[PDB]
């Protein structure tokens, strides 16, 4: 994120959410987390397309 110094390989930047859902993510955490989840919601949009055909 532009809120980071170039070539930073530390965990808090490659996407590691340290807080518990109880404390609550941070801007960065929150954002990555997203990218992360939103994934399934996709291989489900395409899987669904071919799945059906096989099934039949």
């Amino acid at each position: 994120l532009p809120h980071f110094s170039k070539d930073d390989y530390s965990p808090e930047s490659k996407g590691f959410v340290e807080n518990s859902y109880l404390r609550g993510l941070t801007p960065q955490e929150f954002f990555f987390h997203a990218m992360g989840g939103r994934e399934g919601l996709i291989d489900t949009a395409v899987k669904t397309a071919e799945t059906g055909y096989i099934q039949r």
């Binding site: 532009p2 809120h3 110094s5 808090e12 801007p27 929150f30 954002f31 939103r38």
Partner: protein, 92 residues
Amino acid sequence: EGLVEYIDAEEEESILIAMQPEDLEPAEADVDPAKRIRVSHHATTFTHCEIHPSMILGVAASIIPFPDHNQSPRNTYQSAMGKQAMGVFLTN
């Protein structure tokens, strides 16, 4: 009065940004055992700062309370239903 600028995606590449205007500025000369855990301010190059993070959201989410306390996908659904709910779409 040049105190804020309009930075796109491209011109965002070549800059640094502070999350909070405060916390991410002063010096380091204790910490709440309840709060979350934000990293640090290991840099003194900050070209710009974020007004408030919340603004990364869109209409939808903006309404969710504490979206920062739920599995990302939950908020993705809730932002597809507040559209199926009822209310006062105008007053006329």
